[PDB]
């Protein structure tokens, strides 16, 4: 029949690829989606809400990047139409389903992966996350100092990731390796090192990450982590018609684990002084 | 307000770009999107549109790849509610909507172009046009040929682009020149000629169609066609809120030039000499 999405960011970077899947499975079992994005904003999400009770559709499903009180007590009115609120996080023992996305966990894999390969300087461009956190702590345990200058910010956005690697590319000192906090981003830091006459892996290795599906077709194919983002989003639609059909009232847990997946964008650093 | 989309094929190579300018449009607005994907089916298509008149969506939106008599007809039957059916054939006499891309002029830009750059050996990787008709022209005007051994086609996808660029690569004599469909497909291609050793555009030129979003930020930048979805999208969806409030019921046409982008994945041919 028919099925709501109260988005924040349909063309989002992390979000993308998952509400695509859930298109898709609509469409192949021959629904109707009627789709919500608002922007952060009580009132909005507040129509989107409303209006879609209205619409007297078969089941809810919300993504938000937040779930305050205004927002969670909201999503608690209708609470008569089924529904599935991924909370991408803290497991707040409300009534939402929260994902395990295990995002340390490949920030460490991507850390690890670069120092084994035998670099000790380092950068990194990050998001506006856990991976952060975790890419650190190997970096803690290798007693590997990584230099302010070499961290610099983007937005999941070609462009962002290409002035960041200018950025730190265009230092006096600068690294053997950077490891790109999203797939996208690390498309505009390839393009950037480039155009400024360095070669990858040979003159600069780098790791990405999600592993979106062109990132194989990148130039050099790129060696990125794994998150399963058509996936995450199958299962929530499969545990929505549940919730509704078997009646299945009580939560669950949608966790997941990341991979490495080695290609082309790496190199051997000057430290493999130290183990075969 | 709400709006409904009645298409074919979402995720379709060609609507898929002209479906997010729509979508952008809306949540821009404030707006709610009911999505609908037929596939030429008069029982779906059908059902679709009565159950959007239940849900007494304020403006529909049209654009399948075919018209058949029978689908006009319905239409007809709900001509009570606002909209906006978008033909991409031949203009007729009937109450639908033109759109003219112009793609065979686009085809011809880039024919010219390569000749204009001093290419005579070429090749093509064709998506699966009138923009590949536009191009043997240009290629009939200046008496060349291209051997069937050149031309191989691809489906779109980065896969088939690569596939096909290392089997017109991989022969005993090669062009100097591409002509890809698609920058996707392109993506692959350029792929595939950095994994083959070879590099473009010193060794291969690379022409694309399309200039989506990520054009600029390949490795080269890839130099290519401007076919414009998001102006279509954005111009279709104002003409359903004039329609809305009752302004311009009459059949329109909508039509859009594509443009050349010159960047850095094409070089000097070998028979070049024209200035400096
Ligand atoms: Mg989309
Ligand atoms: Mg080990
Ligand atoms: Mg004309």
């Known amino acids: 029949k028919s099925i709501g999405l109260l988005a924040t960011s349909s063309e989002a970077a992390y979000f993308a690829e998952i509400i695509e899947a859930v298109e898709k499975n609509c469409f192949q079992k021959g629904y109707t989606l009627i789709l919500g994005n608002a922007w952060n904003n009580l009132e909005k999400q507040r129509a989107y809400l409303s209006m879609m009770a209205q619409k007297r559709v078969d089941?809810?499903?919300?993504?938000?990047?937040?779930?305050?009180?205004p927002l969670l007590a909201m999503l608690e009115e209708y609470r008569h139409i089924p529904m599935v609120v991924m909370?991408?996080?803290?497991?707040?023992?409300?009534?939402?389903?929260?994902?395990?996305?295990?995002?340390?966990?490949?920030?460490?894999?991507?850390?690890?992966y670069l120092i084994e390969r035998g670099h000790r300087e380092i950068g990194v461009i990050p998001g506006p996350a856990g991976r952060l956190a975790g890419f650190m702590k190997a970096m803690e345990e290798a007693m590997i100092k990584v230099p302010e200058s070499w961290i610099v910010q983007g937005d999941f956005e070609p462009?962002?990731?290409?002035?960041?690697?200018?950025?730190?590319?265009?230092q006096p000192h600068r690294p053997t390796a950077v490891f790109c906090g999203g797939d996208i981003m690390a498309?505009?830091?390839?393009c950037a090192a480039d155009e400024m006459g360095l070669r990858v892996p040979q003159d600069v290795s780098?790791?990405?990450?999600?592993?979106v599906?062109?990132?194989?077709?990148?130039?050099?194919?790129?060696?990125?982590?794994?998150q399963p983002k058509d996936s995450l989003g199958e299962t929530a639609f499969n545990m929505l018609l549940d919730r509704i059909v078997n009646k299945r009232?009580?939560?669950?847990?949608?966790?997941?684990?990341?991979?490495?997946?080695?290609?082309?964008?790496v190199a051997?650093?000057?430290?493999?002084?130290?183990?075969?």
Chains 1, 2 share one sequence.
């Not at 909370?87 to 690890?112: L, P, S």
């Open 213 to 226: 599906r062109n990132a194989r077709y990148f130039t050099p194919a790129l060696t990125t982590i794994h």
């Open 206 to 211: 780098l790791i990405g990450y999600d592993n």
């Open 249 to 265: 009232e009580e939560p669950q847990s949608i966790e997941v684990h990341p991979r490495l997946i080695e290609r082309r964008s």
């Open 187 to 190: 498309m505009g830091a390839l």
């Open 159 to 170: 462009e962002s990731g290409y002035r960041a690697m200018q950025q730190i590319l265009s």
């Open 268 to 276: 051997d650093g000057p430290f493999r002084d130290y183990r075969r």
């Open 59 to 69: 089941g809810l499903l919300v993504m938000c990047s937040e779930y305050p009180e």
């Open 87 to 112: 909370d991408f996080g803290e497991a707040k023992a409300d009534f939402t389903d929260a994902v395990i996305d295990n995002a340390f966990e490949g920030g460490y894999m991507a850390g690890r």
